[PDB]
């Protein structure tokens, strides 16, 4: 009812979701949380919650993820990439299970996306679609497929996890996959096929 009461509930929810993002959600009681949420949303306070969701998860992302995968960059890039990917996936699934009633009542009102789609969108844009990480990931993928073409064996698990998470980030299909990975892949494959054809037809017979 009172605005300070709603603010205290929102701060408790912030502390709870931040503790969950720390991967230490063992000592938490969800009853409390769903309760608080339902209340918030039935107290005519529907968006504050949404926007703050956005904000917090986003902050989390920038800080943590950047640091991690960037410091990787030079190293074990895809390893920590898929690590943070599945960690964020588990965290957002838990948050969706917490805030499912909001996804039921408030999402269909303002035609906005659900918290799961919102989290995947912000992870695709702020974490994946960022400048200094996009070029690095595409160059690493091109390098690993290039060395795969010339005999050097690479762990197919990393590349298959990268491609499956890229096609998952589309939320509709291969939309983002066509522009983030398929567009350089087609041209690099085309030039590689041209080079191999030129080096094959020049000193070999048709047989």
């Amino acid at each position: 009812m009172d605005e300070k009461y709603v603010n205290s509930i929102w701060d408790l929810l912030k502390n709870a979701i931040q503790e969950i993002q720390r991967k230490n959600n063992s000592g938490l009681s969800f009853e409390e949380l769903y309760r608080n949420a339902y209340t918030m949303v039935l107290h005519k306070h529907g968006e504050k919650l949404y926007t703050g969701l956005r904000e917090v998860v986003t902050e989390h992302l920038i800080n943590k993820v950047r640091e991690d995968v960037l410091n990787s960059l030079n190293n074990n890039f895809l390893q920590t990439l898929n690590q943070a990917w599945n960690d964020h996936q588990t965290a957002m699934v838990m948050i969706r299970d917490i805030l499912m009633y909001m996804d039921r009542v408030y999402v269909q009102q303002n035609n906005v996306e659900n918290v799961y789609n919102l989290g995947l969108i912000i992870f695709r844009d702020q974490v994946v679609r960022y400048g200094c990480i996009r070029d690095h990931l595409r160059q690493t993928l091109l390098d690993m497929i290039a060395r795969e073409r010339k005999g050097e064996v690479v762990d197919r698990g990393a590349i298959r996890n990268a491609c499956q998470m890229l096609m998952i980030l589309g939320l509709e299909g291969r939309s983002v996959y066509e522009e983030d990975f398929e567009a350089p892949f087609l041209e690099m494959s085309a030039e590689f096929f041209q080079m191999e054809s030129q080096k094959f037809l020049a000193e070999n017979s048709a047989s």
């Binding site: 063992s26 000592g27 009681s29 009853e31 769903y34 299970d97 917490i98 499912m100 009633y101 009542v105």
Partner: protein, 567 residues
């Protein structure tokens, strides 16, 4: 291969038997001190809440005691009973708390069942409370239904205490709607005034939003009273179906300023090959005919009844053999042109004499003679309790009898006798007999005078309620060598008879006459040409009611002139 059914029901009954004796109880729910042992799997499969709480893998799936707050013990018990059985025992006393508890556990099945139950239970008393409930719990279907119900009877529900405790959004969305059934804008103005003065200290800041929604410069139907009524005969209804349509919706005449008194014809023979048992209405003031989607289940043999509050109902009748008799009760939505079914009757009837008395609709006779005490039964419906109650049955089995209501008293007439029923006494009293024995006659109530007209040969017999005496008035001017068919209906605060006459080698003719009670003379009122009208048959039922032509239906289905007099 489809999943087995008998094994499923056996497993369900075995699970119920195990739950009754408390076997394998792995979770213990604590609600306000009361304990409930239960299984986690059943609560997960039924409610999405418990599923998410158990699949999280936290201490909630490991701890046997879970404290659930803000949940009623009775509602939780009903939810568990539904989860272990599959049946929901809902009632009008604990439906809102059950829906609240369900919306907390997201029991899709229970939520949908409670939603449809609340939708089928909106009457003229809970509308505002149910609207506030749906707004608080964000149920779009229930919200829209309650909003339409409030718009239908705003002038009758704006006095309730639930209306003054509404929120700001509810007020600004109700007042802005052009579907307010009000005859004058002063009613809406006074409603807004009482709403703002109910709690001034909290609504003093909303006075601008309140005044911005009430149409002050509309001047809908007063401007016609200023200049003159000079037009073709009663062409004010033309201004209604023109000015009201093209309007920026800020000065729009509300829907209540659009209702027009039209002669409601049901079961009227139709030229339409598919629906030859359709229903149409004619506006004496508009001289125009409008189409109705009246048949909800392509049936017939149903009676008509118009309450003083201008409500239409049909009951009884029989649907074609897929002619099985039914009990369905349908109320007409004058805004959506669609009938909403109600609680079915207790006994099937064919053309039951439906009359409104003291707010109750009574079903009198209207059935084939089966059983001495089994027939002649009379039953009334409760508009708010939504239930049928049996009353003192008819003294004798009659056929083609009519029923009217005068001074909150029930009257049924027959061949030559007459019985008067009193709901306060619940008894039947034989009244003054009639000098003529006739059948298939039509009767209409006009003041303390009952008009019995018909016979299948027309004679106007007047009964006095105050004198309990029958006096002859006249014979309906008509033609013997032809085919007569009269329908006595009261419109424009005047008794009338809509007589359909089929002459020798000629088509059916339609014309409405006006009767003078003082001079005991029948005057020609208005000739009803077949410009938009056609053969309506002989078994059609007729009544008088006010409907909105604005959005009822628009279909001539009859070219005005067709004279190929070119020669």
């Amino acid at each position: 291969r489809q999943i087995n059914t008998e094994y499923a029901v056996s497993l369900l009954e075995q699970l119920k038997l195990f739950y009754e004796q408390q076997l394998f109880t792995d979770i213990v729910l604590i609600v306000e001190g009361t304990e409930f042992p239960c299984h986690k799997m059943v609560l997960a499969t039924c409610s999405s809440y418990f599923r998410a709480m158990f699949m999280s893998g936290l201490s909630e799936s490991k701890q046997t005691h879970v404290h659930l707050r803000n949940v009623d013990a009775a509602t939780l018990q009903i939810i568990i009973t539904y989860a272990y059985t599959g049946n929901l025992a809902m009632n009008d006393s604990t439906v809102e708390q059950l829906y609240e508890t369900a919306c907390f556990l997201q029991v899709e099945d229970v939520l949908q069942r409670c939603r449809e139950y609340l939708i089928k239970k909106i009457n003229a008393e809970n509308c505002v409370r149910l609207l506030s409930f749906a707004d608080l719990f964000s149920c779009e279907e229930l919200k829209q239904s309650a909003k339409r119900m409030v718009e239908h009877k705003f002038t009758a529900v704006y006095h309730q205490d639930a209306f003054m405790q509404l929120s700001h959004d509810l007020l600004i969305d109700i007042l802005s709607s052009d579907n307010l059934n009000v005859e004058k804008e002063e009613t809406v103005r006074e409603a807004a005034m009482l709403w703002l003065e109910y709690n001034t200290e909290s609504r003093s800041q909303y006075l601008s939003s309140v005044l911005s929604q009430i149409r002050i410069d509309a001047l809908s139907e007063v401007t016609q009273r200023a200049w003159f009524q000079g037009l073709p005969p009663n062409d004010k209804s033309v201004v209604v179906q023109g000015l009201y349509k093209d309007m920026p919706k800020f000065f729009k005449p509300r829907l209540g300023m659009t209702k027009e008194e039209m002669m409601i014809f049901i079961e009227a023979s139709s030229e339409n090959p598919c629906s030859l048992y359709s229903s149409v209405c004619y506006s004496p003031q508009a001289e125009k005919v409008y189409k109705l989607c009246s048949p909800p289940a392509d049936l017939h043999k149903v009676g008509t009844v118009v309450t003083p509050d201008n409500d239409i109902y049909i009951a009884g009748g029989q649907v074609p053999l897929k002619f099985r008799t039914v009990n369905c009760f349908y109320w007409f939505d004058a805004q959506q042109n669609t009938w909403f079914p109600k609680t079915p009757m207790l006994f099937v009837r064919i053309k039951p004499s439906l009359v409104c008395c003291e707010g109750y609709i009574y079903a009198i006779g209207g059935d084939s003679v089966g059983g001495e005490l089994n027939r002649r039964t009379v039953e009334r419906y409760d508009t708010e309790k939504d239930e049928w109650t049996m009353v003192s049955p008819l003294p004798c089995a009659w056929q083609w009898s009519a029923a009217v209501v005068v001074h909150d008293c029930i009257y049924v007439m027959t061949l030559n006798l007459m019985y008067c029923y009193f709901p306060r006494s619940d008894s039947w009293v034989e009244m003054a007999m009639r000098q003529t024995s006739r059948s298939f006659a039509s009767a209409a109530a006009f003041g303390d005078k009952i008009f019995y007209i018909g016979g299948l040969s027309v004679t106007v017999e007047i009964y006095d309620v105050n004198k309990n005496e029958w006096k002859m008035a006249a014979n309906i001017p008509a033609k013997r060598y032809s085919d007569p068919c009269v329908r006595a209906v009261v419109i424009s605060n005047s008794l009338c008879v809509f007589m359909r006459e089929t002459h020798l080698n000629e088509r059916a003719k339609y014309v409405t006459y006006q009767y003078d009670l003082e001079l005991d003379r029948w005057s020609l009122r208005q000739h009803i040409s077949e410009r938009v009208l056609w053969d309506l048959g002989r078994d059609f039922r007729c009544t008088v009611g006010k409907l909105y032509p604005s959005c009822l239906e628009e279909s001539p289905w009859k070219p005005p002139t067709y004279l190929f007099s070119t020669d």
